Design a protein around this ligand. Structure first.
Ligand SMILES: */C=C/C(=O)Nc1cc(Nc2cc(-c3cccc(NC(=O)c4ccc(C(C)(C)C)cc4)c3C)cn(C)c2=O)ccc1C(=O)N1CCOCC1
Ligand SMILES: */C=C\C(=O)Nc1cc(Nc2cc(-c3cccc(NC(=O)c4ccc(C(C)(C)C)cc4)c3C)cn(C)c2=O)ccc1C(=O)N1CCOCC1
Ligand SMILES: */C=C\C(=O)Nc1cc(Nc2cc(-c3cccc(NC(=O)c4ccc(C(C)(C)C)cc4)c3C)cn(C)c2=O)ccc1C(=O)N1CCOCC1
Ligand SMILES: */C=C\C(=O)Nc1cc(Nc2cc(-c3cccc(NC(=O)c4ccc(C(C)(C)C)cc4)c3C)cn(C)c2=O)ccc1C(=O)N1CCOCC1
Lengths: 261, 263, 274, 263
């Protein structure tokens, strides 16, 4: 719960699924991003009671949420800042000409966060590159975890809506709307592909409708040019037909660790 | 050698590095493709002189040489016709909608062919999907083997020419132009990638001179969409930096089969 | 970028009203699919792949294209630009590519049928010529057939927007060398008259029932030799009267080539002569 | 058309209805302000095809449009640069404390501009001190005249919108969306009130809904303290309920000129 005395508004980050997001300083001290929830976008009545659970999710590879402004419509959601912005925007730029070692740490940065969330029995529900944000330390973090539950937008919420993350959804979500820890695993593997493909669109020559059938039909994404054969086996592992035969994040962390050292 | 009196020139099959290619009937029964070897394209003495070592080569998966015509200028080279045409054009097509089991088998037909050459100590020196043709039965065959030896274009034979097969070549060729079966091995792996990717150009967004630097800095290609985790493993194995650590075609054919038992 | 603020109107289609049904193959801009719009209309939908198109240029300028309406053009319904990839939505031609249709030895024409195909295209081209719009890649591969067997011209003026160096440059692998006049090959001088040159070649493609022009030569050899005045011979199933029309398209001097209007008049005269 | 290669982007000047505006220089010389038009904020096709009429509007007291950059996105609109910024701020300074003569001279500058637009059958349609700028010479000039027509925002275009200029609109605009020379006249009187009140908001203790209701009941702005009776008579003449009894900018300029000789 953040009083707005601390809150200065400096520059705007973008307008997101919940409307406008801003960056400033909270406490004239700790740099923040500032979600200014647009009215009617969010199930705030749902969000408020949860919010304790969400505030008690602490990890260094998570974009922590410092607090809320509940004594206003809009509500303000305050998060830590990532000054290097979108993972996707970052991945695409070849100016780094990113090293393979780099991309792998980037997967590790995420797996770390997801392992924590997994042990918290907490689901992202929408794990993608776009929902990852990079900081001044070149460190990538997971954002907007479990906030999908409160989206009021029929295109987003619905499995055939314009906004539903079909390309990150496992066989079961697409069919039975069955979200589990393992549906989180399916998305992480696709993120891994996004990272290795340096910002390429998954299934880019398929539409959302077509993607959703051929996922059932059994086909899968490529091994991106920069992935080793092992590095691929790890991502592909996320993609087992039966969800109970996919690894946990914990498992994926060990496989990833093996590869580095 | 063939009597040119037994060749009838029918349709066109386009043009090649030594010029035009035709299709015809040899003796009026064997349907054949004739190369006509244009002026200055080929090292002509130092062709027919080895030719018997290219001629005597026979395998189910190589496109068969039938002969030549050398008493005449330009010389003819007479080869087995392939209906289903270019691997690279065959591959791309929607009408096939290629099954992954279909790609690996096509990888098997190519590897079988390469292994036989390996046995007979015969380099190809330009292996790629552009250099494979498809018969009526969707059988893949490798052609034009050894012909890179006699080519009289510098752009083709010079590492940096605007023809040189840069995207299909190993570090030891790109930097010191050293050819063995292992640079023929490097070529197969890229070919697998071509097949699994349905006709994508390798290293598409890098130019030939750029790629020639980049592969020489350690990196490679993306295992294609339809490429399995184990399937990539084979194709990758071909791209070892030290040529010794790359596999033989004989091992590859086994590895492919062992995926074949399962997949 | 998108179409907002540009006054496209109904040309900016809401993709929610699109159904995707089958793949149709790939072109220079990537995948194309077949589908329905509003549950009522057969369409083809291009999905513009990344890096393939000068999207900013296309969007600013595409209102001219959308306003092209002729029964012999494969007309554009509209675009979806509030998203990526962009969708280009056009009418569906059920009988597909012209060359396969011609090459179909399963179908055997009267020659009068081939001339009618030439007329259809000429009519499409005369219209474009009237609107001062260059097609820039007229070729049989870029012609489609409806279920009445009518031939229509596709993908006019979209060449402007390709980013592939090899397609754009006259020295490139994908450039339409066999359909280009000397002034295009030597000087990159595009005009209504390069479209005329191409049309003559297209007529040759039709009357040869789908042969590739100059195919004994490479792209670079063809370029060199045309500049040396090489011209295509008369297809066997082509009369001298017909051959004369296509041949007229190939005068070395652009100014001496006919207009599409002149060509249409010539084609009608042959039809009506005999 | 302006070649943007000729333009430098040297300072940001905040954000308007169409988005960001920046300070810059044109061809090394001219000081310029550049509107970078936000996508979907403007009906750009409509503006462009009438834009010539605007460009040619030439008067000393108008913020001159110099040109446009449209072979692009975002589109640019390039104008004269005004150093002392928006009038409303300038007025709200006792850092500058005006004589009343300065205030009247401000009214005359605007009235001169309006008389010219009025002569061109061109409506401003959003005249207010917010849309008036002051150059380094202390001249007030009218800005963004006619650009209201091209706004894509129902909040601004709708009479009951949150952004609509309710406080500057005559009853026939509020009731009937009837814009004319006479609507610009009413707005001008409100603008004179803004000037003499040193930037107070008109009808301050009423909301837009209240203001509309009440002006139809005949509520009128009171005489600002620095405004003489003769000046108040002039602004008030702007506010007749019946549009055809409001003066012209020609008549208003004459009255202002008369006060200046005498007062
Ligand atoms: C107002 C604070 C101030 O002093 N600003 C300032 C301005 C200038 N010069 C200047 C500014 C602008 C400008 C900048 C932003 C936004 C707009 N408005 C629009 O673009 C716009 C208005 C209305 C409409 C409607 C269609 C009517 C709704 C549409 C768009 C404008 C106009 C434009 N020009 C040409 C300028 O010259 C300079 C300096 C300042 C300033 O900040 N200071 C001046 C000196 O003391 C320091 C502060
Ligand atoms: C790809 C754009 C980008 O890189 N932006 C960017 C961000 C940034 N820092 C941060 C931005 C945000 C932020 C801003 C706008 C919108 C959102 N998203 C949501 O609000 C949101 C998303 C998804 C959901 C669901 C629940 C999953 C559906 C809900 C809400 C966000 C997150 C947030 N934080 C914490 C940021 O730190 C900095 C800089 C940029 C940027 O544009 N660039 C930086 C790199 O170079 C310049 C470009
Ligand atoms: C993809 C179009 C296609 O299908 N072509 C096609 C091929 C075909 N069968 C044969 C083609 C050739 C042939 C034709 C031209 C050029 C070459 N290459 C060379 O001559 C050559 C290549 C490389 C080198 C080096 C050594 C690398 C330098 C030298 C020379 C070739 C090989 C040859 N043979 C023997 C063929 O059988 C038949 C038919 C087609 C074809 O046009 N179609 C296929 C069926 O549908 C209709 C269209
Ligand atoms: C020859 C195969 C065939 O018949 N295909 C076919 C097509 C069809 N109808 C349509 C196809 C397309 C279409 C599909 C893919 C790619 C393209 N090309 C481009 O998008 C393109 C072309 C040129 C350019 C430049 C810029 C000029 C270089 C860019 C892009 C096209 C055009 C489009 N429309 C509108 C179609 O209607 C229907 C059916 C078939 C087909 O498979 N058959 C025909 C009927 O018998 C069965 C087989």
């Amino acid at each position: 719960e953040i009083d707005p005395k601390d809150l200065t508004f400096l520059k705007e980050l973008g307008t997101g699924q919940f409307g406008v997001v801003k960056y400033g300083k909270w406490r004239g001290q700790y740099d923040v991003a500032i979600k200014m929830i647009k009215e009617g976008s969010m199930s705030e009545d749902e969000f408020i009671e949860e919010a304790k659970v969400m505030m008690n999710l602490s990890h260094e590879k998570l974009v922590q949420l410092y607090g809320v402004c509940t004594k206003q419509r809009p509500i303000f959601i305050i998060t830590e800042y990532m000054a290097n912005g979108c993972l996707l925007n970052y991945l695409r730029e070849m100016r780094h000409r990113f090293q393979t070692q780099q991309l792998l740490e980037m997967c590790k940065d995420v797996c770390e966060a997801m392992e924590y969330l997994e042990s918290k029995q907490f689901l992202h529900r929408d794990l993608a590159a776009r929902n990852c944000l990079v900081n001044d330390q070149g460190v990538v973090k997971v954002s907007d975890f479990g906030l999908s539950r409160y989206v009021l937008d029929d295109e987003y919420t619905s499995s055939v809506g314009s906004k539903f993350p079909v390309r990150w959804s496992p066989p079961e979500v697409l069919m039975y709307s069955k979200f589990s820890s393992k549906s989180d695993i399916w998305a992480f593997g696709v993120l891994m592909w996004e990272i290795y493909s340096l910002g390429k669109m998954p299934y880019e020559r398929f539409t959302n409708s077509e993607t959703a059938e051929h996922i059932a039909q059994g086909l899968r994404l490529y091994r991106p040019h920069l992935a080793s054969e092992k590095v691929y086996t790890i991502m592909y592992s996320c993609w087992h037909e039966k969800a109970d035969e996919r690894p946990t994040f914990k498992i994926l962390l060990s496989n990833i660790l093996d590869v580095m050292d």
